[PDB]
Amino acid sequence: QFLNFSLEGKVALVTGASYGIGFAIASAFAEQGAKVCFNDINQELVDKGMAAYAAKGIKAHGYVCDVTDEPAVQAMVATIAKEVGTIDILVNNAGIIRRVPMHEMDAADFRRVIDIDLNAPFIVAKAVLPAMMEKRAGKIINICSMMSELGRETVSAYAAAKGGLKMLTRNICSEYGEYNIQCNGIGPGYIATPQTAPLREPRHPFDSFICAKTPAGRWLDPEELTGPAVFLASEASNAVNGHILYVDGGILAYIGKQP
Amino acid sequence: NQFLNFSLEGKVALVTGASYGIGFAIASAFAEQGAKVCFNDINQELVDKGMAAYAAKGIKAHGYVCDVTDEPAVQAMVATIAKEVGTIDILVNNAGIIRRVPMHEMDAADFRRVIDIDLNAPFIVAKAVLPAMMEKRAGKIINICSMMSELGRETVSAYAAAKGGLKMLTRNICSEYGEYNIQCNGIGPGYIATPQTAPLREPRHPFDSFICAKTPAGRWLDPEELTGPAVFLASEASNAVNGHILYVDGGILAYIGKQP
Ligand SMILES: NC(=O)c1ccc[n+]([C@@H]2O[C@H](COP(=O)([O-])OP(=O)(O)OC[C@H]3O[C@@H](n4cnc5c(N)ncnc54)[C@H](O)[C@@H]3O)[C@@H](O)[C@H]2O)c1
Ligand SMILES: NC(=O)c1ccc[n+]([C@@H]2O[C@H](COP(=O)([O-])OP(=O)(O)OC[C@H]3O[C@@H](n4cnc5c(N)ncnc54)[C@H](O)[C@@H]3O)[C@@H](O)[C@H]2O)c1
Structure with a gap:
């Protein structure tokens, strides 16, 4: 049981998992025997998702839910509690990137990014915790970024969010x-x-720049994140708590390739 | 010696929320180093109290009633300081609120408020003062983080999330x-x-005992302890120091704790 990476009979909710990272994590969760749920912002994106989950032989429970709408989230959770079961594994994947010089960025834009990338993970976690607290078992995996540590130009708001999500992780722990x-x-x-x-x-020039910064000397295929994701959702990582598990291919550990 | 000048002679400084407390200490210290000091607070009562205390130390603080989450109001405050006092050289995002509520019981409206004031506002205010700085090719933006930029605790969920974000905001503006x-x-x-x-x-x-245990220096830090560091980060001596969170903890973050 200290080495069981199985998610057999565990209810999982990966926000924004119609495609991309969230999809890969949700697909791998299903593959480990988890009852997979997901949500997105409109019906079109859910239908596309449902189709792709079906296409791998997965009965995903898709929902149209805005994660910044607390009442709507509250509902979505109670619907999953009713139809599928109380949530055991939350993955706050849903988020948005915005590239705008900070001085030029509208206050409305900044707030949006924080709201979806930081505040929403709060709202969704808040909803699924009462369930977990009762049964005395739960997993909440927040998808941070390298921007939880490092800044770049334009991605000011996005970094501020991800750096905040990093502490939110540590606080929920x-x-x-x-x-x-x-x-x-x-x-x-x-x-x-x-x-x-x-x-x-x-x-x-970009790929060259990335393979320089990366010791592994390559980009990471999304499925590379699934192993780690399953690990943190498994019962093997019960002693791992408040931890940010960077899956970077060595970047944060490496000063860089220099001529 | 311009690598060792801790003087803030003829530098315009804005410390948000500096009617009392840390912000007050920092601003008082900035004045003492020859800075033209400005501050703001949320209502006229708190500004007047502030102005009185700065006046009581022989300091001509330029007080303003401004909400830091109101971008237009901030935009205005900055241009008024640009007009009357001069373009801002030293921003200190001190203004912020603490809220102790179990995360699962916390209203989404509450959480957002804390983020808005403690994270988003620092963005707004920094946004307003940066054009000035970028022109003159010289500026200091000091964000007051917390130990909650590293460590979580019960109830202080939103507050931590904010301060941890402000930490990255700091790294990004750098x-x-x-x-x-x-x-x-x-x-x-x-x-x-x-x-x-x-x-x-x-x-x-029991609390003082617990704090002195966690603290190597074995004591509470008097607000004035933050002033030295603050002046240092505002001074021209810290020009190579950038994107850095200077923790002034008395050793806490370096210490696992006092154990029986
Ligand atoms: N290289 C990368 O792509 C990379 C690197 C680091 C971190 N991340 C993070 O990984 C996560 C997933 O990103 P991704 O690459 O899969 O693409 P993404 O960020 O587009 O995925 C988020 C999904 O959530 C949806 N969404 C947006 N706002 C929503 C809302 N309010 N409510 C519900 N759903 C909403 C989007 O439509 C999308 O399908 C994000 O949090 C992102 O910041 C990605
Ligand atoms: N032990 C501590 O007190 C401690 C420890 C670590 C960090 N901090 C941080 O240091 C900073 C200063 O702490 P403090 O105790 O001096 O002040 P505080 O936390 O009591 O509040 C700062 C000031 O900001 C003002 N303010 C709040 N919202 C505002 C708004 N929207 N617009 C304008 N002004 C507003 C308040 O009126 C107050 O005077 C804060 O960021 C706080 O979180 C404090």
Whole structure:
């Protein structure tokens, strides 16, 4: 039981898992025997998701829910509690990136990013904790970034959020760890998504720059995050708590490749 | 010697929420180093109290009633200081609130407030003062973080999330505007001996005992302890210090604790 990475009979909710990282994590959760749920912002994105989960032989329970709407989240959770069962594994994947110079950035924009990337993980975690606290078992995996440690130009708001989510992780660990709730975090490095496929075509200055910073000397395929994700959702990581598990391929440990 | 000048002679400074407490100490110290001091608070009563205390130390503080979550109001406050006193050189995002509520019982409205004031506002205020700084190619932005920028505790959920975000905000303003010779650093106060906490140091108190255990220096930090660090980060001596959270804890974050 100290080495069981099985998620057999565990209810899982991965927010924003219609595609991308969240999808890969939810797919792998199903593969480990978890009853998978997910949500997105509109019906179109849910239907696309449901189709892809079906396409791998997965009965995903999709929901149209805005994570910044607390009443709507509260409902979504009670619906999953009714239909599927009380949530055991929360993965706050849902989030948005915005590239705007900070001095030029609208106050409305900044707030949006914080609301979805920071406050929402609060709201969703708040909803699923009463369930977990009763049964004295739970997992809450917040998807942080490398921006939880490092800043860059334009991504000011996004970093502020992810750095805040990092502490939110540590605080949910602090407060609810006694109920045998493990709240950890996953910090993806440079992930090779379909959107970034152009940047790996013919010696590209960007791909060269990334493979320099990365000791592993490559981009990380999203599925690389699934192993870690399962691990933090498993009963093997019950002693891991308040921890940000960076899956970067060595970047945060490396000063860089220098001529 | 311009690498060792801790003087703030002829530097305009804005310490948000500096009617009393840490912000007050920092601003009083800034004045003492020759800074033209400005501050703001949420209503006229708190500004007037503040102005009185600065006046009582022989300091001509330029007080303003401004909410830091109201961007237009802040935009205004900055331009007024630009007009009357001069373009801002030293920003200190001191203004902020603490809220102790179990996360699962906390209203979403409450959580947002704390983030808005403690995280988003520092953005708004920094946003307003940066154009000025970027022109003159010289500026200091000091965000007052906490130990909650590293460690969580019960009830202080939202507050931690805010301060941990402000920590990265600090690192990002360093990343983005460092090239204009703008140093954005942070100060992380430990357990500060405030007037509010005076009861907790009366007669062996379990709390005072617990704090002195966790603290190597074996004591509470008087607010004025933060002033030295603050001046240092505002001075031209700390020009190479950038994106850095200077924790002023008395050793707490380095110490696992006193154990029987
Ligand atoms: N290389 C990377 O792509 C990378 C690196 C580090 C971290 N991350 C993080 O990984 C997570 C997943 O990102 P991704 O690459 O899969 O794409 P993404 O950020 O687009 O995924 C988020 C999903 O949530 C949805 N969503 C947005 N707002 C929502 C709301 N209010 N309520 C509900 N759903 C909402 C989006 O439509 C989307 O499907 C994010 O938190 C992101 O910050 C990604
Ligand atoms: N032991 C401590 O007190 C301690 C420890 C670590 C960090 N800090 C941090 O240091 C800073 C200063 O602490 P403090 O005790 O001096 O002050 P405080 O926490 O009592 O509040 C700071 C000031 O900001 C003002 N303010 C609040 N909201 C405002 C708004 N919207 N617009 C304008 N002004 C507003 C308040 O009126 C107050 O005078 C805060 O960021 C606090 O979180 C304090």
